Amino acid sequence: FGDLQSRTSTSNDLYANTNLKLQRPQAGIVHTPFTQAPSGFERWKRDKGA
Amino acid sequence: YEHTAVMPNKVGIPYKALVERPGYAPVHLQIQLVNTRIIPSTNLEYITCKYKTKVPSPVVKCCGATQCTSKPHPDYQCQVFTGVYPFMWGGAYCFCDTENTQMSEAYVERSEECSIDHAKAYKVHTGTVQAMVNITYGSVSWRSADVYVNGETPAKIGDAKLIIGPLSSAWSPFDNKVVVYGHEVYNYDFPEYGTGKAGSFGDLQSRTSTSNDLYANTNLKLQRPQAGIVHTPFTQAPSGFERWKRDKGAPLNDVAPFGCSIALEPLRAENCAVGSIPISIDIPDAAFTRISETPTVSDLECKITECTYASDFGGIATVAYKSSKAGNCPIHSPSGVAVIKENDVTLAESGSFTFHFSTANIHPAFKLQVCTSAVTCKGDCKPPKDHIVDYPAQHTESFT
């Protein structure tokens, strides 16, 4: 939970510790593959307590 | 000059020993094991893979029976049916109502996929291990020798000649029966040739991909076609090779202890760190120099600077050299308490030169040999809080 935190909806500053690391592009193809942890807010949205 | 020495079996660990050659200046050694390939002897038994039930066209006599023949096809199942009335797009196939008989036959033939994907059974023997050794001793600073472990074979690359092994441990990660699947190795116990149970592993067993004959026990049994339709309903167990492919155990390359890894290869188990090697080496006397040339470094002292009770070279110390002439000087600690990464130090007139080392004792009291000059570097060490280094190089864990 709280993988991405903003001080308010309009706040231009934010904190995002999501382990985003870039990856080598595969087979000389023009793209930007990135290795990224699953959305923290999606977790605890399927297994929230009562 | 013939320095026999037992050596622990590690890959990334040096063996910078010192030769106590009388009458000449002592020469340091240095031995490293790049590879420890085992390569056990192996004998192929058979190869298994998914099968394909190549069912030929049925034989349908419109009015009259037809006895079948026992063809030599593998698992050739043939059976004749009576009282059939096949239809096709062109209407009913015969005018008889009971003499219609169908002669349906089917046999098991290895699938086309066997050419690429196929398990390999292997029975192995002890075999003979090999190693690649790098020796950067003396002033030559290089070697690139491939060597055996038998206690007879000399290895005489460059100028020096030496003999390695035999290993102290006969430990072989491979079992007597080994199954190889494309790239991973499993020590599964394949039963034997020509005895595989249907549905289990090795339901179809072929001696070799080239071999025409095979052993196909698939429990194939034909059954009567239903409602008067031309086809060959055959009931058989599911492909046994398909099973054990989705529920095989962990590969041997992922459960072999001592950090040994395998490859699609003569089946060497490299980096199998276990046991020791009785290393004997014959240094040529050419590298030796007259003892009367080495500068005297007597009346010196050793001071510890900062030792870390860790695995990396955290220990440092300064030596107050008291020399007369100038020249190279090998450094080595005969005691196994501490290991010195530094190899050679040039000596100035009464100078001081720091060196790095690693230790495993809280208060290391280790002898230091400096080109025929003994001195004890007693000191204290401090354990580290950030245990984040390469793999340990001290290799000297004992009572502390």
Binding site: T35, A37 | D254, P257, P384
Partner: protein, 96 residues
Amino acid sequence: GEGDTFKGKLHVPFVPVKAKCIATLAPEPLVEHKHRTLILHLHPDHPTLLTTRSLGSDANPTRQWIERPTTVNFTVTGEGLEYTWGNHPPKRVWAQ
């Protein structure tokens, strides 16, 4: 046909071959270190099995497919430990 099986041996059009497919790669785990124990904080996107194998005399292997995000631990002995998370290259580890 009751007469004979004529010739006409015909090649299979599409023969299976050992090509190189592109496979997925799981997100790298978040490694947290403790005293003589390895904590693997990880979040799998799809069911992946991780394998651990001690480098000592006793392997003590463990294979475990994991789907939901989970936290696991490992007693890293002085001999050392190695783990393979997904299809990433294997990594080894020390102990002090």
